[PDB]
Design a protein around this ligand. Structure first.
Ligand code: HEM
Ligand code: HEM
Ligand code: HEM
Ligand code: HEM
Lengths: 146, 141, 141, 146
């Protein structure tokens, strides 16, 4: 996936403003609320029984932070997403057995969370750039499946 | 199916959209054309530039149909029956595209109505938009 | 919706499958695992090698559910209700995968029943398999 | 996407036995029958109102020859599908306004037609190779959209 130089600058600038303590947990939590069958992968995380329980679950927040950190790693290596995510791709396939369609769902949930957090500033051109990013991350995470 | 809570959530969120419905529909279309350029293949006769009068007019058509669907949430197949006829016989938009606009409508609502866009309401809105999309393509074959 | 002609076509084609239903279910699964390797993520507890007993047993279960749906083509939601409950609460397969298996079932039928797999029957079988898939995912949220 | 050398050999061997003219008309006809909304692009072809009308339509057959001839030409460049199809991609976007999802639908119909014609010879491994081919062609034809 190819971001223009203007798109790269816009994605980098917005990402610097992200609340790294909250955005990842909000994306993971919304995935588990909006697509509740995805809770299958997180049975060990405890109480996922209501939207409030999901979003306030400390394990959802903590894991979401790790997910966000991996997204940050991708944003720092936009010309090599496949190499950035190869180890996590093997992990999600061989160890965790996660259908990569879920990476698409999570990417679009993250876009919704960015729109929620940034309001007006999440303009249609900024969204289009982030759609390229989340698709590229999903493709890279799916790449080592076999 | 849409639960009683889903219907309550959708009516509240779309009620708050209110008179902004057409403007938000136009923004959702613009987001979709920029993010998912293949959707532009259905509008070769449109000026798709930012602030386009044709995009604004189409946004109003989309939004007004959604307002009607919300007002008839208990029986959307009947309320949308003429529209689904027209889709199956003329417009014939591939089903994949409705998911793209639905996502862009969620983004638009999240960016505009942060107090309304809770996780539960997000879930209900996504179900509602998927149900509308299902009705629109229900007569395709 | 399945038309009168769709029902006739599905019943005729599946009737010709006859005793081979379980074998064709296993072949469709094997085709899907080889062509669409992401589908294997739902089977970490299976030997997925060619001819494995687990794939054979699962193919029989898939085929039996399809045979039952054919026998209940007038009311598939009711006939598939228990299976749809199990999908929503336990199996939780993403909807995209049903399209992959459905395609592989069409390929399997085409490769075994050339006289039966006419364009009209192909169209009806695709509608039928999509209708079954919709029921199976209908209670997910 | 990329095929193993064994997959390339299997693709080329099967394709040498394809009547490209006949299979193209059959695949295009089946696209219009199975997914009848795709008829929107072909009003000038006349009567498409029943399966027999579609499958017997002489314009469907004549166009299918051209479609599958271009597909066949692409099989000569399996390592460069995007380049080979760039002009046709630009044409389908800029002049014909064809949603590229249609290329994915036609690719899977083609797979069904190959299975129908060849029977048991269209083994699960041969199908897997052809799935990579049709996905690569669809992706190549979608690549110049903007
Ligand atoms: C698409 C972007 C995603 C990224 C960047 C990502 C990243 C990560 C990372 C960094 C870890 C921790 C790895 C480790 O500590 O060794 C992890 C674990 C995990 N991921 Fe993902 N992930 C993504 C999507 C998903 C999705 C969509 C699902 C399921 C629906 C999922 C399921 C899991 C599970 C179950 C674990 C192990 C959690 C545990 O029990 O500790 N991942 N992921
Ligand atoms: C929430 C989803 C949608 C709703 C409620 C909706 C509603 C409508 C309505 C009310 C019309 C006018 C129909 C009439 O003439 O009576 C229309 C037309 C149309 N829509 Fe949809 N629409 C939706 C999504 C889409 C999407 C995703 C696409 C394509 C990517 C699309 C493409 C079109 C086109 C091309 C027309 C004809 C426009 C023209 O030529 O003026 N729509 N839609
Ligand atoms: C025509 C579509 C399908 C039908 C009719 C079907 C039918 C069935 C049936 C009858 C069962 C047994 C349920 C029981 O224990 O009572 C089952 C189980 C299962 N299915 Fe589906 N299935 C279909 C597609 C799929 C797809 C596409 C996938 C994943 C890619 C899948 C994954 C599974 C799994 C993982 C199980 C549990 C197997 C086990 O643990 O033994 N199925 N299916
Ligand atoms: C393997 C995929 C495809 C290939 C290789 C292909 C190739 C071609 C070629 C070679 C032409 C003739 C161009 C010329 O003579 O200048 C053409 C025209 C055309 N294609 Fe495609 N095509 C594909 C898929 C599709 C699909 C799936 C659709 C729509 C459902 C489509 C819609 C059209 C239309 C409308 C024309 C113009 C027909 C006319 O002259 O009336 N194409 N294509």
């Amino acid at each position: 996936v190819h971001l223009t130089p203007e798109e790269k600058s816009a994605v980098t600038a917005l990402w610097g403003k992200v609340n790294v303590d909250e955005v990842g947990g909000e994306a993971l939590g919304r995935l588990l609320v909006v697509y509740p069958w995805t809770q299958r992968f997180f049975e060990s995380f405890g109480d996922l029984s209501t939207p409030d329980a999901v979003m306030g679950n400390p394990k959802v927040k903590a894991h979401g932070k790790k997910v966000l950190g991996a997204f940050s790693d991708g944003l720092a290596h936009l010309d090599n997403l496949k190499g950035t995510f190869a180890t996590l791709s093997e992990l999600h396939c061989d160890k965790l057995h996660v259908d990569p369609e879920n990476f698409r769902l999570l990417g679009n949930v993250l876009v919704c969370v960015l729109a929620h957090h940034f309001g007006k500033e999440f303009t249609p051109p900024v969204q289009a750039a982030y759609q390229k990013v989340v698709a590229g991350v999903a493709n890279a995470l799916a790449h080592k499946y076999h | 199916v849409l639960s009683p809570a889903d219907k309550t959530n959708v009516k509240a969120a779309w009620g708050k959209v209110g008179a902004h419905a057409g403007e938000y529909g136009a923004e959702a279309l613009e987001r979709m054309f920029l993010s998912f350029p293949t959707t532009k293949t259905y509008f070769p006769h449109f000026d798709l530039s930012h602030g386009s009068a044709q995009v604004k007019g189409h946004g109003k058509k989309v939004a007004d149909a959604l307002t009607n669907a919300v007002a008839h949430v208990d029986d959307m197949p009947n309320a949308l029956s003429a529209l689904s006829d027209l889709y199956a016989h003329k417009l014939r938009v591939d089903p994949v595209n409705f998911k793209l606009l639905s996502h862009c409508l969620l983004v638009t609502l999240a960016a505009h109505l942060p107090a309304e866009f809770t996780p539960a309401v997000h879930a209900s809105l996504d179900k509602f938009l998927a149900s509308v999309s299902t009705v629109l393509t229900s007569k395709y074959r």
